[PDB]
Design a protein around this ligand. Sequence first.
Ligand SMILES: *P(=O)(O)OCC(C)(C)[C@@H](O)C(=O)NCCC(=O)NCCS
Lengths: 72, 50, 50
Amino acid sequence: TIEERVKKIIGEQLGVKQEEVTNNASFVEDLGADSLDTVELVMALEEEFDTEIPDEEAEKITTVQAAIDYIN
Amino acid sequence: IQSLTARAPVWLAAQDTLNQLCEQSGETLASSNDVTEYMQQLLEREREAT
Amino acid sequence: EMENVQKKLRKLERDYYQIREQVVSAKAGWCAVMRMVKDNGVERRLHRRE
Ligand SMILES: *P(=O)(O)OCC(C)(C)[C@@H](O)C(=O)NCCC(=O)NCCS
């Protein structure tokens, strides 16, 4: 479904398969994505949905679940 | 920022080199003195081996 | 006056999303070479930060 986008791109972006991304984990350290990687990730999500997410809102997406929470 | 940027390449090359040279040794160096003491150890090992 | 700034922002946007496209595609592609890097032949032999 639509979330498959997110769960895809994240796994696509951070080099982790779909199943690796538990909702409870945190991108910053659990997924090993650094500031550069996290910015790339959020930007990829935003372009994918062609939506807009101001960086301040982006700052809250540190956890896996938040990714879809804001989306949906 | 510009000063540090200009300085950087030298320092990073210096690191790379020390990193290699040190892992070559069974030790982690931390100080110029530390290096001199390592020199003393090397000299003793040499004057033994000979 | 404001209408011209509106058009300027349109120009900025048309640049911006396209830069996003580039970056996301590049990272997608480059993930595989980092996977290879995790073949652990990687070191300053390959990763040459300076
Ligand atoms: P970190 O060592 O991963 O470095 C991050 C970074 C400073 C290079 C940069 O990519 C970043 O993550 N910046 C945070 C967002 C930001 O600064 N926005 C500026 C908007 S004009």
